[PDB]
Design a protein around this ligand. Sequence first.
Ligand code: CLA
Ligand code: CLA
Ligand code: CLA
Ligand code: CLA
Ligand code: CLA
Ligand code: CLA
Ligand SMILES: CC1=C(/C=C/C(C)=C/C=C/C(C)=C/C=C/C=C(C)/C=C/C=C(C)/C=C/C2=C(C)CCCC2(C)C)C(C)(C)CCC1
Ligand SMILES: CC1=C(/C=C/C(C)=C/C=C/C(C)=C/C=C/C=C(C)/C=C/C=C(C)/C=C/C2=C(C)CCCC2(C)C)C(C)(C)CCC1
Ligand code: OEX
Ligand SMILES: [Cl-]
Ligand SMILES: [Fe+2]
Lengths: 35, 82, 335, 340, 447, 32, 137
Amino acid sequence: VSYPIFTVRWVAVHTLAVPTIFFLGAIAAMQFIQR
Amino acid sequence: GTTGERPFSDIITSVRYWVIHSITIPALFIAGWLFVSTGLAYDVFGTPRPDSYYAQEQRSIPLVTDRFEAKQQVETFLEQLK
Amino acid sequence: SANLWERFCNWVTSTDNRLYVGWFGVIMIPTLLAATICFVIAFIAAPPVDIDGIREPVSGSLLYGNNIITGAVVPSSNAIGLHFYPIWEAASLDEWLYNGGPYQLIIFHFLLGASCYMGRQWELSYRLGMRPWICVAYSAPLASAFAVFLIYPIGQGSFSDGMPLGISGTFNFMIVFQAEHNILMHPFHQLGVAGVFGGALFCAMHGSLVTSSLIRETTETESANYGYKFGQEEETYNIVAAHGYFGRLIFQYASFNNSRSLHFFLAAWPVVGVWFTALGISTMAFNLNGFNFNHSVIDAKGNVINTWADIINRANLGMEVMHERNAHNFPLDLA
Amino acid sequence: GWFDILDDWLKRDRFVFVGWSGILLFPCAYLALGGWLTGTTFVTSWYTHGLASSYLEGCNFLTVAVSTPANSMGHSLLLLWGPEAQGDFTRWCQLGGLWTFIALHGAFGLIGFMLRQFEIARLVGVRPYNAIAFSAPIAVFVSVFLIYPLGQSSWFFAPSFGVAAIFRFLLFFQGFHNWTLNPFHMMGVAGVLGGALLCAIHGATVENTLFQDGEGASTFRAFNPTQAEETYSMVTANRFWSQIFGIAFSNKRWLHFFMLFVPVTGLWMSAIGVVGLALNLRSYDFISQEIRAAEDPEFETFYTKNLLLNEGIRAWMAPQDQPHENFVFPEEVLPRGNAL
Amino acid sequence: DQESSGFAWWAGNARLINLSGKLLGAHVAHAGLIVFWAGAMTLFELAHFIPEKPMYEQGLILIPHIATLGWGVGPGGEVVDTFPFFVVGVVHLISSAVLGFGGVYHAIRGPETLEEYSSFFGYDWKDKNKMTTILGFHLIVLGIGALLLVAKAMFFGGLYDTWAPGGGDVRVITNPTLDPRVIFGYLLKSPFGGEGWIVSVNNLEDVVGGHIWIGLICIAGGIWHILTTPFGWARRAFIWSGEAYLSYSLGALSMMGFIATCFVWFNNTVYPSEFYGPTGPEASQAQAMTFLIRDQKLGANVGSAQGPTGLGKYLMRSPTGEIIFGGETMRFWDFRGPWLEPLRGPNGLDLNKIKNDIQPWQERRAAEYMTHAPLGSLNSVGGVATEINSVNFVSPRSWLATSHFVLAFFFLVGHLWHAGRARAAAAGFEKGIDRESEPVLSMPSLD
Amino acid sequence: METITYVFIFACIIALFFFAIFFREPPRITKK
Amino acid sequence: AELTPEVLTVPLNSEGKTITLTEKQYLEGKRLFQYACASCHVGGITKTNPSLDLRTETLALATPPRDNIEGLVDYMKNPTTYDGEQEIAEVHPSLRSADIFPKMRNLTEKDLVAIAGHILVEPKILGDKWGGGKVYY
Ligand code: CLA
Ligand code: CLA
Ligand code: CLA
Ligand code: CLA
Ligand code: CLA
Ligand code: CLA
Ligand SMILES: CC1=C(/C=C/C(C)=C/C=C/C(C)=C/C=C/C=C(C)/C=C/C=C(C)/C=C/C2=C(C)CCCC2(C)C)C(C)(C)CCC1
Ligand SMILES: CC1=C(/C=C/C(C)=C/C=C/C(C)=C/C=C/C=C(C)/C=C/C=C(C)/C=C/C2=C(C)CCCC2(C)C)C(C)(C)CCC1
Ligand code: OEX
Ligand SMILES: [Cl-]
Ligand SMILES: [Fe+2]
């Protein structure tokens, strides 16, 4: 079949995936903070 | 048992996907990393740094005591080098 | 007579009995009858019990100032500990009732019978040509009774620390447990409520989905239940219409279409979760407690920055500091 | 008409069904989950509870939380553009604005979600017994996260969104409300525990009374997705439980409704009890018990024991659990047993 | 060879029930994993091991197992030479490669079945003769092993005896209790408070002696099963199938798993408090000791001291009259230990020895065990759930006991599961009720 | 008075148990 | 709100003279305090004798004075009772009893000074917490 690319599913998936990794990257950096 | 969307199996398997996402996915990661490591996150959410919970001598907590003049009261708490 | 004993064995094993008294039943029925009769009599008329062995009798029976909610069967004395205390071990019944004698008689008989009850849940399944493993599901609530009535006392070194047989007495067991073990901050317990919440969740899930996808065979002013006859050939609900709905609620592949894969999950989730919660009490019976994040996050100077974990610790201290008033003589509670 | 064309699009069978409900559900639901995940990692609870509550401060998955606003705020909605935050975002965060954000948003998200159930059921043409059931989780959230603090002094005494922050909410209700002694609560656990039993027992019963519809041992493949005959022997199941337990089902339609009733009814009862705890109309004591306990220093039940535990909880927790009260409890006034 | 048309993927290892060859590979590859762990872990423990520091404060569970056998230790459990630890570790780790080799080989190269490639090694589950024979083989192998312990104890060095006359030290046992009345007496002992059944062993003479009996008996039954077949009742009672035999051994391990849990938690002898931590009762006993010692030095008469309840602050009586420690520690009046025994008399704790025979080494021993009770958190924070972070510690007795109970339990479930299937497999309905011939439908209605 | 009330209800539940088990409606197959 | 050298300035001897520790010494002391003290002296208390704590004030009224580097260090070698009228090295960890208390074998004079410093710096930071028990947790 000739499937499309940008779809409603694509939107949804990204609304969760994009912030997630951005957070996973943020948290990963926190592991090195100290005092 | 099927709809318009392109079957995940194909996409997660397609070389084109990875050619894209080997760039995109690490990019966000490094971005989130910088968000913290540059101390920006501290200012965006007013989260105290390890040396910004109390004043040097003070051992009291900066508890907000009134709603309407809270914002003003909060700023006053930052004043005492907190 | 073809043979008395041979007939006897045939009556026991008989699948034509209203209640299947099995071979496990031969042990179950007497033990359960002893437990229940002693319980009922105790719960009503038993005298106060010196649970903590400090000569400080705790009354938990109806006739002695209690009601259903407060009333309980008080655990054996702490002076007895893990010692075996049958009726024939006491100078008199008066002494036996004072030292929490009934408690042991009940829990031992119960746990014994309740185990045979599991054994019987296999036997009948065998005699009827159906698959076993039903008893395996019952192993989870049983292992909890075992953990609460036997394992924890063994670990702690006394039956006086086993869960009392009553409503308010059960609440006491929990509050104190939380103080000394911080059970809320333990993975196994968390897995427990996960199975229990999920269980109730899934129970409502399945329940609703099925009953909502019933094939119409009833009148507008007639009970929808009558649209089913005991001993049907075909199904009474449209499992394909059910999957169609729930498949659209979330998304298709996150929905069951296999009734067998469904009911397995329906059984697996709670049993496994309760299995862990049973292992939780059994693990914390040897003082391997929940996470201790007290005074974890501290600032650049060294000051202690409190978390919710600290707020929990304060509540726990109050329980610890106040439980069993006159029972302690020394700083550390190591028993 | 544009409406029916708008309708057409929304009600289109996609991978993730949108629908009219989706216009309410997805925005709120996403912001609610997002707001939590945000505060969980970044926002602090220092200026509101004197607590660290984020990964950024060093909290872990258990100790993290989106804490309630200060007691000063009252029952304020705490709008970003409200008199408190005054449009400021950072201030808004520090005043626990994210709590009312998560709460109110999530609340509407629960409204949209049940509406979705209603909307999807109608389209598929199935009975809405999935929406009726979902009323129990609603009542709980409404009663606990909204009604309860609305009866108290402020949002501050509502359960904070977080693992540990919920555990103290439990211990609090014990110490202060004696929540375990409440009949409505007892019915609650009776429904949940009994519901988690029905779930277990029914699944196991079915899997172990199945017919043989295949030649393999893994009987999972041997199921017919297209109805037809019953996949498990309802008749055998009946005779089984009738002999081991004495009582047994014999009407699948009732058995499944029962599986709906029990857990939904339980949660509803637990809700009513909490609604009473808002006005502090708790089931704390038994007057008959206290009166004898006063006159008679030798009368002791497991009930009296528990109350002493409550006194300990209240005294030792209140100072750091209610900062706004500026509590100061001298060592000598702290209720304590011997040695400990 | 084997795929979906036999079992499901998540039940894969059940496709090997009738593949003796490959089924041997698994057991040999698996046995390598056990040797691998034992080896690699010992070296891991040693790599972190600090000599001038208690073993229980270092999370050791294998090195203290070696210490018990009299290896690298001396007076009071003092670590002398760490070489035997290094040896035991590396030798194992090596043998894992040998076993692992055969394991991999028999499972992917060698014969998929054994019956043809060797009729001696090939077997039939229903072959009651081969089964009791293979069982007879292992019954000897285990039998010799039991004597391997006896040899080390009597000849090759001895064992660590905490009850040592001059104080805990490696001692050569040259007088094993062989009296059957004494030995088999333990089996007739109660499992409750006081009479402690098997766990109540309190001297190496019985330990070594008992193992002599087991060693002989085991090999004796080993020969018996080689040269015989199951009787009449033995055949009409059990189920004879590959799964059935598994189940029997599953419940067996479960039972032993429970016994081991109580052993490491209660026993003092075969689990020295010098290498492991102080046992649960021991620690609570120590606290009573400690403060009895303290306050007495402040001029208090411990004998007549009256506690809050009027029971006896420091000393009270047991239900049978013996003089014991006071407080909540009344539940642990069944505790026996080297440090405490010299204070005990014919009627329990002697008030005269307590008054002026207290030795300094006992005082600090009590202090030691008191501040090292088996209390801790999952994240390893020693003390009560309300303690503060500082002392990173959780008694090895706690780790072992909890771990081995979970395993023991799940194995009892594994038992029920596999025994229930075996009964249904044999009679033939482990795959569903026969749609045509439904048994229940042929039984009269009880209604 | 209270004790009596508690035991009575309890005794009533046990009585019910009996009738529920041994005096139920006979579960009839197919032709129901 | 940080560990300044202003905070790490503790009295060296009885004659008023002071010493200034470093963030390296502090951490090292804190670690060593966990290694050989925390077992009984967690959070400044004394499990085997709750009557005597590690409060600076308590150490000051000791005999001899133990509220300084020199004091504590001497104690860690030859410990005495609160009046000093009795040596307790036999039932208390010390250098002259390292054979009895293996943990004290490694410990060198540098370690002793670090541990001593830790005891004096903690109350400066924690305050009432350092002295009290569960009440201040
Ligand atoms: C449909 C989805 C939806 C819904 C129901 C809500 C609902 C809410 N949001 Mg919200 N939000 C959404 C999507 C949604 N949000 C999205 C997608 C975002 C991301 C941009 C946000 C971001 C967001 C933030 C950042 C905040 C909220 C907040 C709120 C709450 C208070 C807002 C308020 O006062 O409403 C006002 C209601 C209206 C404006 C509706 C008016 C509709 C009428 C018909 C229009 C009339 C206009 C006309 C000019 C009037 C003329 C009258 C004349 C006399 C002048 C409320 C629960 C606040 C909150 O949670 O506080 C704790 C808050 O601070 N929202
Ligand atoms: C001597 C021990 C022993 C042996 C030899 C067997 C052998 C067998 N079992 Mg088994 N079983 C045992 C103990 C044992 N069992 C115990 C103690 C239990 C109770 C839990 C079970 C429960 C059980 C069930 C429920 C089933 C079997 C089945 C089987 C058969 C197929 C094997 C299989 O499914 O592998 C497949 C193996 C896996 C899918 C791996 C499972 C992984 C586990 C669950 C997780 C372990 C957690 C781990 C410690 C954490 C690691 C962290 C991770 C991040 C790395 C096979 C004959 C199956 C069968 O066909 O019945 C005859 C079957 O359905 N067993
Ligand atoms: C103790 C763990 C263990 C062991 C020893 C085995 C052993 C075996 N399994 Mg198995 N299995 C296990 C766990 C285990 N399983 C678990 C947990 C699951 C669930 C996921 C399964 C699921 C499963 C299925 C579904 C099947 C088996 C099968 C088999 C058999 C054939 C293996 C095969 O196909 O080779 C194929 C080998 C390869 C593809 C290459 C793997 C590389 C090798 C084997 C490992 C090398 C080890 C090491 C790194 C090398 C050291 C070398 C050194 C000594 C020099 C074999 C006896 C099959 C069977 O029934 O046999 C007919 C089969 O169909 N297993
Ligand atoms: C089973 C026996 C056993 C016992 C008693 C111990 C005991 C110990 N180990 Mg150890 N270990 C074991 C097996 C065991 N280990 C194995 C098999 C391995 C190989 C992976 C290791 C590898 C290992 C390392 C690398 C280290 C230890 C360390 C330690 C010590 C510190 C304990 C600790 O912090 O762990 C805490 C561990 C946990 C809290 C994890 C609990 C995991 C549970 C069991 C998961 C259960 C979930 C369940 C399976 C989910 C399945 C359900 C699903 C199917 C639905 C302690 C003495 C440490 C040490 O010596 O330092 C002092 C150390 O560094 N161990
Ligand atoms: C559980 C252990 C076990 C068992 C039962 C078998 C069984 C078998 N193996 Mg074998 N094997 C094993 C472990 C085992 N293996 C290991 C660990 C390895 C890796 C080194 C191998 C490597 C291996 C190879 C390379 C081959 C076999 C083969 C065979 C088969 C032919 C018999 C044979 O070669 O013996 C012949 C040898 C003897 C009869 C005598 C050996 C005695 C040794 C030298 C002493 C053992 C001492 C022992 C540890 C202590 C016991 C004494 C104690 C009672 C006091 C047979 C089915 C062959 C095969 O596939 O043919 C079908 C084959 O080519 N095996
Ligand atoms: C683990 C090793 C092992 C295993 C698996 C077996 C397995 C078997 N043996 Mg056995 N045997 C062994 C070691 C072993 N033996 C040793 C070492 C000896 C030498 C003493 C013997 C001597 C021996 C004889 C003389 C006979 C067997 C027989 C049998 C077969 C039938 C067993 C039976 O029906 O018992 C079922 C047991 C009962 C019905 C009795 C139950 C009552 C028990 C003993 C008491 C309650 C147990 C309780 C829960 C545990 C508490 C401990 C207790 C001390 C208080 C079976 C294949 C018989 C056979 O078929 O011959 C080939 C037979 O006649 N065995
Ligand atoms: C607030 C706010 C907002 C919102 C925001 C958002 C919406 C966000 C989002 C966010 C997000 C959305 C985030 C996410 C995150 C995520 C994460 C971070 C995750 C993680 C994960 C993990 C970690 C995992 C784990 C696991 C599990 C769970 C299971 C098992 C296994 C594993 C381990 C894998 C706005 C702007 C509107 C407005 C203002 C305010
Ligand atoms: C069958 C199968 C399987 C399994 C497998 C196995 C189980 C294997 C095993 C394996 C093994 C079991 C291996 C072993 C190995 C070992 C080795 C190889 C060793 C080595 C050693 C050495 C080398 C030594 C040396 C040293 C020393 C002495 C010290 C120092 C360091 C060192 C370490 C170097 C699986 C599941 C996968 C899959 C399916 C099939
Ligand atoms: O009992 Mn109930 O409480 Ca387990 O802990 Mn110790 O003893 Mn008594 O004290 Mn706490
Ligand atoms: Cl209490
Ligand atoms: Fe069902």
